[PDB]
């Protein structure tokens, strides 16, 4: 029906919806830059890195979205999701146009990749200009996009995380997949058929619907100058949660500018902030 | 036990004093961009008491009730000082405002320089202790409200420090929510705004051994830090803590004895 | 009724009860002795120290009650609370004459301190003549009053203890305070309201009715003769519980003659004797 | 179903024996006014056996059954000595009378000098072992008192040595109406005032290495001391613990193996 | 008739069942060999040591039961129970013959101990020819009888084990004891009373019906050659349960050929632990 | 998912390949006396793939489903080899037959030396890592027959690899008649003798640091060995693990996040 309606359109298309305008602005920005990036490399990595200094651009790119920094700060997850929709849609339209061109060239109804199924891309942005160190990091910046400059001290070995868990209900008899934010498995509750309501709550790992993305934990401490003896005090360390392509990007002993949305850790005085990394830029 | 009219009187007097005293300070507070940030106003205790004795005795009697009234006075004083100020984009209102009490009238009875004993619960006094253990910045979501499906019910669950900073649990089914009340609502997961989380720190301060009041072993006082007061102090320095003495008790059991430890929810921390 | 009756005794004021005669005898004894003691100092400390040798005085006190030692041994708490009632009542009646004279001079309808509430004072006696060393202390000493010549080794920092935890009932809507011996909340059960009866049980420490008294735990061990190397072995360490003014009176490394009633350490290896200290007399 | 005739015979013969030999010891026991120490009577085994053959076989077969009857015989013997004695207030009666049986005839069958195996449960025998670890003196409770408002409850349950010192409550009460509530919890019941709390010192004794009965590693027997016997044993000395071999079993769990370890409820720990 | 089978349970011994014929074969074998063993010494030990090598002999020993090794491997518990039943029966019948001689001598039909209850003695097999090393020990060996030559490293002190736990039902008011395999108490469930049917489940130890046997846990490691430096690696060890007379027979630092049944140790994912049948010392 | 006809085709071609190639190995397998023992057939991947291209793609797509069909082909080939072999007592049938696939064709996508990432779950690959820890040989109660109040309940529960070896439960409740059938009574728990095990074990293989693919810290992969693969590897030995990557998830809790780690059920362990 609509572009990316299955996953990204949780809400149906609405011209009044502010989300649509952000999607159009981001997809236009990408469409200017499609020639530079490599489509196959992006699909292989499953993500795209876009410089934030290029994101903050005059005239049309800032006309559609008046305050890009404010919008990214207030709702980092929403803006990143809209940017991912924009990149996924521009890649889909590029593949559609390329398939049409291939059909024109060969002159045959059959074409390569008939399904034209585009895997999900998590758009990522780096070189975020406003940067906050441990002193600026506090509970106020919860749910706000921040940029750090701190070396990683401890790196966890790669571990999986269940981003989507399929739930099969005995009364329903069919599997239901629910989006899962950073684990913490959520009850599906309502189901498709009104009468059954999905009363049974059974996890099902066997289903292909259940998808898994790797989770890597790295702890970063902001750089502390050694010019003074008072300087060099033990620095605060904030945990970093990485996902998908970002895993293995960090290497211990290397300063990384981890610019991403930050969230509290329920498991862990009951919570403590960790930045759910959106992009990691290596020193080299 | 404060009457509504009495609360209004205290708030009005505090507003007038802080407007006449910290006009430049409140303007500078409104200067910064970050509205979510915590802001100290640093109102002096002794001059405020000289201005009106009733507010002083009420502050001494019930600090835990007076301080929210001071925060409301901060809110409306900020209203007035912003409407007085010319530039609107440069000067933004700060809903996150907290009153800081400093310069307590130096009296042995009024200010207990020693570590408080159990007689000092619910009394504002100036503990002077040297930090020994500095816990990390463990933020706490004080409000873990379970929003009702029906409009205007707005069920709210708030963490209380007397209850070992444990969130209130809606075990009782008096409300129409019933089982929906006790089940968790992922307000924090959906967005930042539904979750009301501001930071929480614990530091243990022992009385200075140089002072003659201290005993054979320096008694240790645990201090709960809040808002801007977090990270204001580091281990190994002389610290003066103006705060409200409180006691926290772990979830209690039939067989177990009550396990209370006195805490000082700091109202102002000054590094000597 | 006698002032302070409810604070010391739950059971109501009844002249037929034998405790009344003990209270009157102690009141007379304090009346002879009230000149030496300072009323304001006693009120400030919340305690009174009376030498046991004064308790063993012949004639009247021996005639009024036959066996002070036996009554202290069998029921320490009852005799101690009777003595505390006596000191409370004699202080109240002295203040009553003083207020009567002051009212005579001033002629003021509202007298100074119209509520005239006198804080309850836990009467404490020192130099208990029978000494029961901790080695002699048997399990039958539970509920008995003993005196220990022991040296304190470990002094816990001052910790609040809830002597009264007011319980508010949601069904009733009112707050009722229950006497709380060393925690272990006692269900209020019946209340003033007959129908509601107090079905709900919700602790409420926010109420002013809830009161707290500090609790400092000190462990004492008997000094042993150093004639032989095998001698000088540290005897069993018997815990000691201080309360109210007694807290901070003990100092580690100092011999203290602790004369107090003993209870069982049900809170726990599993059970030890701890003396709920009544009076602690330091070496100096 | 125990016969009352044999119980009465054992009690009367034992009390008559102890009167006609241990009279002066009973005079000394009552003469001491203090109740601070549980008072032992120390009746010898072999002379008691030769005086009456039935007592010997009953005691060896069922020591845990015979010893309470011996305590009752002590009560009647104390009645007799009190009425026999001339001065009433100098010597007073003591409910806490316990019979300690020592001087067992040294035989391999009669006295199992080696630490008992599971064959020796419920048999009175000498365990000559050197104590290694002494636990702290404990109050415990003769029973977690069952307080019932309903009259003539006449239900008595006591802390069982076999059941790891855990209070046992039968499923159905003896009375036709039964208990008002299945579980009755009271402050008096939780407190040890209604119960006869006694010292409890749990020591472990291992075989003497010089003895041939010891293996490559010395086996260890855990010994429970009660009443006066507590504090009689000191670590590092040889102890001849005449006692009744019993079995403690921890609260059973269906998947878990039945966990039972041999124990010895001492009768008289004569220190060599 | 036979004591302890028809009295306890309504079902009688079935000659059709091959287990009964196995008992007959083993009791005949013990009958021809009973001269060497001592009755009183065996009763004092509580068990009989019967050679597996002697039993593996041909002719009537193999004629009575075709595959003795295969039967003993497949269901060791049944074979050992039948063997112990046979030795118990032959000892009882020998004492019955002696009592008959005594009755003839005295001339009084009444005799001391007419009930003549005889303790149950577990039959024990040593020198088990098929030997399985600890490396070979696998989940396949579970439920089978193995013989291992290993050196015990750790010997736990003797600890009771409740082989029989009496159960009294509150509604029923009577006490019955249920056989208990290596602890892990099984609830009595059904009882004699039909209506009450044992709805109340109360475990008690004071009852004389409850019985207990020794349980000494010894851990054995297989002896390793010192020929190569590769040899000397950490040895495989399986826990060994010693029960009844077998306790104290093992001594630390000694090599023992523990020919015992192996079962799973549910407490600690399971690990095979050999419930020892017979332990033969080096000497 | 595989279809029945596809299963039949794959099994038939696998059986034909083993009959034409590994027949002598099957003879050697059935020659051994111990029927309960586990036996490797050692089928080679590249030859099997070049014989039939459908087998290659289907095995690479769904190893976990293909391997049981391979075991069924083993059983049929064992039928054929048993009827082929003249001596009956010498050649005994082996119910415990498990296919071993070795020598994958050299392809970076099919076989990748690196420790698998979460994308590699459900795919067959060669994971070359040096064993660091060798956990003890802990056999698994893989199957426990469950009978309940329901007549002929005969419920069969298999310890699932993805479930951290917790017994599987029906998604749709068949025990509608009573709660007794809903609850599970462990037959193995009551009596030790009746059970069955597959010789479970765990080793952790750490990627060789000398290789270019490995990161700064060599990643470790935990390997689950089942059946005869146990005791085939030792710590500190260069080990190549051809296996099927799956993931275990610990029992979930509402507050707790999904706790998973990649695991590798080895299909062949070869000492380099």
Numbering used by the authors:
A (entry chain D), C (entry chain F): 15 to 282, 293 to 308
B (entry chain E), D (entry chain A), F (entry chain C): 2 to 273
E (entry chain B): 15 to 282, 294 to 308
Manuscript text:
MCM8 and MCM9 form a functional helicase complex (MCM8/9) that plays an essential role in DNA homologous recombination repair for DNA double-strand break. MCM8 and MCM9 proteins are structurally similar, with an MCM domain at the N-terminus (NTD) and an AAA+ ATPase domain at the C-terminus (CTD). The structures reveal that MCM8/9 is arranged into a heterohexamer through a threefold symmetry axis, creating a central channel that accommodates DNA. Multiple characteristic hairpins from the N-terminal oligosaccharide/oligonucleotide (OB) domains of MCM8/9 protrude into the central channel and serve to unwind the duplex DNA.
As our previous study shows the hMCM8/9 helicase complex is unstable for high-resolution structure determination, we first solved the cryo-EM structure of the MCM8/9 complex from Gallus gallus. Based on the electron density map, the structures of the NTD and CTD were reconstructed at the resolutions of 3.66 Å and 5.21 Å, respectively, and then aligned into a composite structure. The structure reveals that gMCM8 and gMCM9 alternately assemble into a pinwheel-like hexamer with a central channel. The assembly pattern of the gMCM8/9 complex with a threefold (C3) symmetry axis is unique among MCM helicases. In addition, a distinguishing feature of the gMCM8/9 is that the helical domain of gMCM8 contains a long α5 helix that protrudes around the hexameric ring. The dimer interface between NTDs of gMCM8 and gMCM9 is largely composed of the β-strands from the OB domain of gMCM9 and the flanking ZF and OB domain of gMCM8. Compared to the strong interaction between the dimer interface, the interaction within the trimer interface is weaker. The trimer interface is dominated by electrostatic interaction and hydrogen-bonding interactions.
